[PDB]
């Protein structure tokens, strides 16, 4: 039973490690290679940044939280870590969303949009993503104890204390996952159906890649987002193990992003391999 507790820090730790290394390779390979420095890859840059913060901070602090048995760092950095994590994860999702939009417009408007869209617009949509994420999550997270008048959070554990109140939990969760997944999936549907007219290559490859992307986003972000809804009705409903796995499943999206967006392109991987030796 003593072997058990090290294996988890090895798996989660090495997964975090792989995460940050991967996204660092994304950022590096974009700044180094001038050919892949297209407007579409700026969104990949912002994405890899969010996934980097997530990779190094969220993953390791949650690794600590889980491996110790409690949150020993205090209310200040609990509120902090949670605010940060939720904000930058929402930022990741909004990034994916804005990527979806961009790809839709690149498909429907095949010649006009790619020229009309400038770098300034990309920076604007990125900033919009981060700002909206921050506004939607941060103020509600920290000041939920100043408004209620009591920190509902237990001394040992560290969770968002608006979870007890379903009314806000739903509204925040849907604007973070449900609404955005609906949007992404629907305009990706528009992409697949409008782009490529059994269909030999176009519809085949498009449907394949789109499927992989959507499957990733869902398989990672859904379990927690549906468990957050489960626990909002009943407190003893969900086992802490399953909860932990929901959290981690959410984290590994930020690990798999350089595989669905970057490496799914042919050149990116070639650019990656030189960083080895």
């Amino acid at each position: 039973k003593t072997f058990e507790v090290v294996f988890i820090v090895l798996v989660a730790g090495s997964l975090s490690l792989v995460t940050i290394i991967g996204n660092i390779l994304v950022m590096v390979s974009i700044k180094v290679n001038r050919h892949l420095q297209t407007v579409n890859n700026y969104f990949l840059f912002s994405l890899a940044c969010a996934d980097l913060i997530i990779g190094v901070f969220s993953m390791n602090l949650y690794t600590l939280y889980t491996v110790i048995g409690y949150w020993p760092l205090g209310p200040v950095v609990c509120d902090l870590w949670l605010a940060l994590d939720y904000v930058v994860s929402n930022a990741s999702v909004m990034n994916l969303l804005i990527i979806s939009f961009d790809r839709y417009f690149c498909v429907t408007k095949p010649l006009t949009y790619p020229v009309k869209r400038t770098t300034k617009m990309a920076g604007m949509m990125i900033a919009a993503a981060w700002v909206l994420s921050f506004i939607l999550w941060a103020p509600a997270i920290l000041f939920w104890q100043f408004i209620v008048g009591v920190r509902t959070v237990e001394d040992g554990e560290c969770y968002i204390q608006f979870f007890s109140n379903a009314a806000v939990t739903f509204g925040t969760a849907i604007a973070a996952f449900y609404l955005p997944v609906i949007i992404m999936t629907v305009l990706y549907w528009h992409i697949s159906r409008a782009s490529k007219s059994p269909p030999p290559s176009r519809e085949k490859k498009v449907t394949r890649t789109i499927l992989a992307i959507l499957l990733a986003f869902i398989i990672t972000w859904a379990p927690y987002n549906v468990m957050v809804l489960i626990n909002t009705f009943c407190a003893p409903c969900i086992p802490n193990t399953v909860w932990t796995i929901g959290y981690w499943l959410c984290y590994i999206n930020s690990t798999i992003n350089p595989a669905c967006y970057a490496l799914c392109n042919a050149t990116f991987k070639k650019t990656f391999k030189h960083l080895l030796m």
Partner: nanobody
Amino acid sequence: QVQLQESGGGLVQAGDSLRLSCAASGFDFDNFDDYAIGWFRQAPGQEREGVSCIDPSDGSTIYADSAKGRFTISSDNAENTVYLQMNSLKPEDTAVYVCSAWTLFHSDEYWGQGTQVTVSS
């Protein structure tokens, strides 16, 4: 990797026709089939507007609202070289014609160097 060279750049009087040809090369683990190719013209100081675009894999033709009816595009899938023939030109088509190749979702984006097409009268 791929770099794209153009041809057919010359002088023509109004009403005449030209054939600009774009040749792509240098494929490894990627296929010319995996690239959708378009023609962009640039007038002096004006926006780099896109004339026409073709997908060789599907054979799907997509033209711009300005060049519809005069311009025709196709290719040679085995030779990995595309052909754009334009007919009944006006002196308003005086520009440098460059060749672009986007992979799905614009990840691998390539441009050429371009050829000059000056129309007389």
